[PDB]
Every structure is written in C-alpha cells, then in structure tokens.
Amino acid sequence: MREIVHIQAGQCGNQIGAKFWEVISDEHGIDPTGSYHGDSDLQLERINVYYNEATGNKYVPRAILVDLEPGTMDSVRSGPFGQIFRPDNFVFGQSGAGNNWAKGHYTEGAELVDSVLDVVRKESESCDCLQGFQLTHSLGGGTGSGMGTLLISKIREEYPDRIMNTFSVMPSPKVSDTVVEPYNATLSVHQLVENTDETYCIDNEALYDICFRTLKLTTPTYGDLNHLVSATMSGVTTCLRFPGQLNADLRKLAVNMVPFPRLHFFMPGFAPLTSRGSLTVPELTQQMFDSKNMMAACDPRHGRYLTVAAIFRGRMSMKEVDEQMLNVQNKNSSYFVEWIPNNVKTAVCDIPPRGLKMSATFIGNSTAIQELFKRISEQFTAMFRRKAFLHWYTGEGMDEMEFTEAESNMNDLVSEYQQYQDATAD
C-alpha cells in the first residue's frame, strides 16, 4: 500500500485538483519545475504515494486530467503548477456536456472513458505497489458527475480489490442556481453508494455559509471556496503523505471508518478557518466538532457519530491532545454511538500546513449527514414531480425508471442513517 493514482474530472474536478497539487507540493517542497527545494528529509518519506521519480531529482505528480471541454486543458497548463503534469495524461474531448448527466455518462463520456482507462493502466502498471485511487469532481455538472461515476465503475471492473476514494463537491443554489444539478447529483449518489469505498462530502452550501458568515466575505468567489477545499484535502491526506504513527493505508482507514458498506460518506472538518492572505489545544478540539467548521451543511448535534478520525498538525504535547479528546467525548457523549466502543481515533503530525503553526482535521461518519441528502432529494423531487427538463436526459437514451430508482436509493440511504441514529446497545 503506497502509490495512489490521482484522477481529476470536470471543471470543478480539475480546479480543486489543481489546488491540491499546489498545496501539498508546498508542504513536500517541490517547485513547478519538479525539483526538491526542501529543508527536511521528512518530506521524502512516502513521497512516492502522490509522485513519480524522474531523472534529475524531478518529482512528477501521479495525476490524470480528464474533461470533455477542451478549454479546461489550457486552464491547468496556464496555472502556476501547470507544467508539472505529463502531456500524455491530458485526456480531453471535442464538446462538453452542458450540465447533462446523460451526455457525460452515456454518450460523449462513453467515447472518452476508454481514452482515460488506457492512461490509468500506464500509471497503474508503472507503480511499484498500488493501493487505490482518489477522484476529485463535482456532482452538479455533467462531466465530473456523469463521466466521473462511469469512470469509477470501469476502473473497479479492472481493479476490484483496490480502494476507491472520491472528493465529491455537492451542489447548492447559493453558488450555482441551476435547476438540473439536483438531477445530476442524485443520479451520481446512486453510483457512489455502490462503486466507492469512501467519499468525502464537500458541500458548496457549507462553503458559502463559511465565507459569507464566518469569513465575512460579501461576494465569495470559487477561489474563496477552493481555499477551504485545498486546506481540507491536505489535512485528510496528512497520514497519506507523512510518517507519524498511522503508516498511510487507504484500506485500514476504510476498515476503521466504514461500519456499513453504504454508509461511506464522510463529513470533513477543519480549523482554524482562515481567509486568503490573512490556537491552543483546547481551542482546536473545540472548533473541530463545531457545526461552523464542517465542510458539509449539516449540524453534527442533530445526529450521532458512528466513527471519528482526527488529525492534529504542529508542535503540541501528545498528552494534552489525549486529554481534550477524551474530555470532549465526555461532554458530548450523547452524540457518539454506544455500540461502537472507542470510535474516536486521534492522529498527530509534526509538519503543519504552511502559514499555520497548529491545525486540526476532522473526518466524521455521522448520521447527521442525512440532512444534506434530504436537501438534494427535496430539490430532486420538486423538479421531477413536474417532469421539468426530463427530455434533456431521456433523449440521450436514459430510461425514466433510472430517476425513480436513483431517488428510491437515496431515500433508502437516508432511512439507513436514521435507523442507526436511533439504535441503542442496551
């Protein structure tokens, strides 16, 4: 378990995926040319998890870039870390999807998925010890949502025993007022329940409420939202990129966080929330479980925690961290399930993110995530009751039963979260 093949699909997938490679390269000390200008050899331990090793001390990220829109190709190249990618890993088509989940999943994306799969093998077969894949994309679009979930199922058919991980961006009318996005998201959640082992729920609704109300940003931009996404993806992959004690394993993370196979949607959290260009141990643990620090528009005090993983970063005494985490479990014992003993794991890392001396990342499997799924389902039902724009989807060959099955699957997913939220151990 070492190498991880990163895949970014769509406009949102390539955008938030570019920020991921800019932030973690700063932490590992890698310039856009590829050289290692670091000051500590700790940045090269398990460096091959997200990078290949080329001649000249040049580290090449193990990322594959996908999008039907040809304009996204030049959007990454013209970035700061733009030319640290393989020209052979750019897979782009002629036309886009236009927020149509059917075009990306059945017609347009079906012609380009095999162009991506052959690039996945070249990265996979050239890996020493591959463990799994991670995907960044949005669910409200047509490419990252439609073709993204299709690409997941095609990869799993050729790598069944590998771990599938996704960073899914949930749609929200506060950031994108498009009425067909609840169609795309609901159809994609129907795919993510079956073909992924672990999914981080990054909610644009929660990201807007953080920039607008907490960060006091009047008109939040995508760069404002992606500042939180890049800061969250870095913390959740801290063990995956540094030694510490947890030796970085996507499988061991899933065995300890996913008690039931369908309930593999994680609620990420981060503290302290900082803007752009602008805390004690009892302070980090406090905000870590606060509703204002979660990247999913859900109140954790409305449900119960099945499993929780926390990553502390920076200079801090190991004993004090074990005291506060046990103390917060005492003051908030009613929000943890009593039939999963010792369901809170604490991780520590010496190297903090840049610009910060201490930080904390929250990875929670809480039943309160049903509030997010109830929201997307309510928007889906209102649109589907009136059959609005359904011809945009059935014209590409989709069956109307797929909409009824996708809504029925997510309603059952919400019902499963409620069953365990009310269960007792006695």
Partner: protein
C-alpha cells in the same frame, strides 16, 4: 538440551521479539555479531543456552527465531538495526500487502500466499535441532496478521508437529494504544481458532503495561519502546528456566504440568516485581518478603484483573538474584495466611519456588533500575476471566448491530464463524465460573 523455536508474527510480535533477543544476548554474554567469548566449545555445544541459540562453524551464535509479517516495514528495521548481523537472513519473511487489521485477510486471503514459505523456513530450523521440544509464538490479538495469520500458522504446526508443545505470548488490546476499532473482533476470532492448538498462553494486557510505565517508571506517555522493554524483561523471566540451569519449568512440557490443570484453561497470569525507575539509582534495596508481597498486588500484574476475586489453581515463584531459600519460605509462610489467597479444593495448596542466583540484566537505554533481587510469579487464577468478560462485551456491542462485519465476509470468511467464536468464548467463561470466580 532440547531446542526451542521462537516465531514472531506481525508488528507487535516482531518488535517485542526484537527487544527480547537483545536482552537474551546481554544475559548470556552474546555480542551483536553472534560471538560468545565465554563459550569454550566452538561449532557446537550441549549447554542450556543452546535451546535458544545455534552455533555455526565460525563460532557464531544465531537465534532459533523466525520473523514473519505480511508487510516489510517493521522487519526492515530489524534487517538494518544493531543486531542485523545476529539473525539468519532467510528467517525474516516479509510480504507486501498486510491484513489491514482484518482477521479474514490474515487467515484466508493474504496469509495463504506466504504460509507454505513460512513453514519451509521453520522446517529448516527444525532439521538442525537434535531434540525439538516446542515453539514460542509472539503475536497480537487485535492485529490482522497477529490474529488471522497466527491462527493459520498454529493450525499448520499441529499437523506437522503433532506431539510438540506450543506456547503463546499474546498482546491483549488496550484503547490507549489500540490501532483498530475491530480489535475485539480479531481477538475473539483468533482465540476460538487457536484454543485447541495452544498448550499455554501468557497474555500481555497493553493497558496493564501502560499503567506500570506511567505510575512506576514516571513516563507521562509510554510509547511502544517503553512498553516492549518492560515486556521483554518479563518474557525473559519466564523463559529463563528454559535457558539456564534449574529445577522449575526446565522444559515446555513442565510449563503445562505446573500451570495448566485443564487444556482449555491455559492462560496463566504473570506478575513482576520490583519495577523501579532508572532515575532512582540509589533506591533502597527491597527484601525478599517485600517483593513477594508485591506479587499479590493487582497494580503489578500483566493483565488487569483482581486475583482476590477468584481462586488459585497453581502458583509458581521464579526469583532472580541475591535470594536465600530460607527467606522465601519465611515470606511464603506469612503470605500463606496474612493475605486473602484461596486455592480450589481439588488442588494441593502449594507454592513452587525456583531461584536463579543471578540478578536481572538491564539494557542500556531502558527505563528500569538495576535490582539485586526480582521475582516473576506465574499463577493460573480464575480472575483472568475478567479480561475475557471485558473483551466479550465489546464484541457483543458491535456484533449485535453487525457493524464492520461486511469487511470480514468479503475476504473468504463466513458470518457463521462469528457466532461460532462467541459461543466458544461463552463456554470458556463458563469453564472458569464452574471452577470458582
């Protein structure tokens, strides 16, 4: 001289095995390259330490140990450590993909890809022995390899080595340093599958060793290095009778004759004293009676339980150092009455005593202080069922909701083995209760 083979499985078994063999070399006078200056016979020997160390033609003393792990990270540090020149290179077996804290991966899917190679290397050490008497297996309860792969290994050793003995040093899980949430599952599954194939098992409660390091060694947050150094100190006191001259527990057959009255109840309790921090180098020297009293204090036990809550079926005392035999008899005579000690009706109320007149050896860098006399008590009491009761409760809380069960069923294991293992545990608690607890 009858040779013993030590087998180390998983990170816990390998790291504790590494510290154990370091302490063996300091106690026997063996250098990291394997040279033993006080060994007159070169190329062979009939001495007591030959039960653990073989001898090559060049005067090299090599442990009779095998290190196995489904991933190479932990063993690679033994391949490049201080004692890298000591172990046989072909006895360090490493895979590439571990069991992921999943019993099913270690026993069914991943473990089967290396099981035949492990037995062929074990066979090579067995062919070098003139009188192999048994095996010593070091593994964890909560790990995928330590639970799944060990049970598969124990099943295979019973077929190839039918009449040989097999002892365990198991690592009981503790939430303070636990790695997986499913460790109660792996602990119950490997116990049910290894119970028939094991003759005697010394459990090491990670929480018991954790509290001793905090309370007696003044360590604010004990690491794996601090725990393993104290564990190896107790493992050496247990296996010292196999490695030196004496008359108590001289071979593996005597271990179960003295400690195991019935096959299923083969979990003795180990108690060690004194534990004194190295920063108090000028401490007062405890007497034979004061360290003997400490053996009946629950704060010195290797498994957190209350011995005065149960009955004793066997009690063996192993002293090390400046110890006069008449001082032990006087210490027993008081403790035989002044302490609430109860033996079952069907056991002859006795205390077997063995004395080794060499004081314990401390490793450079440890946290323990030099002592002139120490004692390790091995006793089979029904109070150790409390450890199973605490472990079965966490099992019941999760299995009732079938949590994490799909991870096991997806790796060749059937769900019926879960219910079958818990029933075997309920009968084990019923075995201790029908004796007296």
């Amino acid at each position: 001289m009858r040779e013993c083979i030590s087998i180390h499985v998983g990170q816990a078994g390998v790291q504790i095995g590494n510290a154990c063999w370091e302490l063996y070399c300091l106690e026997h006078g063996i250098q990291p390259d394997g040279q033993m200056p006080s060994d007159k016979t070169i190329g062979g020997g009939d001495d007591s330490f030959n039960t653990f160390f073989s001898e090559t033609g060049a005067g090299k003393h090599v442990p009779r140990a095998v290190f196995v792990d489904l991933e190479p990270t932990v063993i690679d540090e033994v391949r490049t450590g201080t004692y890298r020149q000591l172990f046989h290179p072909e006895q360090l077996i490493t895979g590439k993909e571990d069991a992921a804290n999943n019993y099913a991966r270690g026993h069914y899917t991943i473990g089967k890809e290396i099981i035949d190679l492990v037995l062929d290397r074990i066979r090579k050490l067995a062919d070098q022995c003139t009188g192999l008497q048994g095996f010593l297996v070091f593994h964890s309860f909560g790990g995928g390899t330590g639970s799944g792969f060990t049970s598969l290994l124990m099943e295979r050793l019973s077929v190839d080595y039918g009449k040989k003995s097999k002892l365990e040093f198991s690592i009981y899980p503790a939430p303070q340093v636990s790695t997986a949430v499913v460790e109660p599952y792996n602990s119950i599954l490997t116990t049910h599958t290894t119970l028939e194939h094991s003759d005697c098992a010394f459990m090491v409660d990670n929480e018991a060793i954790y509290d001793i390091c905090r309370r007696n060694l003044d360590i604010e947050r004990p690491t794996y290095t601090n725990l393993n150094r104290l564990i190896s100190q107790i493992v050496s006191s247990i296996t010292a009778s196999l490695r030196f001259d004496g008359a108590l527990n001289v071979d593996l057959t005597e271990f179960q004759t003295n400690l195991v009255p019935y096959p299923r109840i083969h979990f003795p309790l180990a108690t060690y004293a004194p534990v004194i921090s190295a920063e108090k180098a000028y401490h007062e020297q405890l007497s034979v009676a004061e360290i003997t009293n400490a053996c009946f204090e629950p704060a010195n036990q290797m498994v957190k339980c209350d011995p005065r809550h149960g009955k004793y079926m066997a009690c063996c005392l192993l002293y090390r150092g400046d110890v006069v035999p008449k001082d032990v008899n006087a210490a027993i005579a008081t403790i035989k009455t002044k302490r609430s000690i109860q033996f079952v009706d069907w056991c002859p109320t006795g205390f077997k005593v063995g004395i080794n007149y060499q004081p314990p050896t401390v490793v450079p860098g440890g946290d323990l202080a030099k002592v002139q006399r120490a004692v390790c008590m091995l006793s089979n009491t029904t109070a150790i069922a409390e450890a199973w009761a605490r472990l079965d409760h966490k099992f019941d809380l999760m299995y009732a909701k079938r949590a994490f069960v799909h991870w096991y069923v997806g790796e060749g294991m059937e769900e019926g083995e879960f219910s079958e293992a818990r029933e075997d545990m309920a009968a084990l608690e019923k075995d201790y209760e029908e004796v007296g607890v």
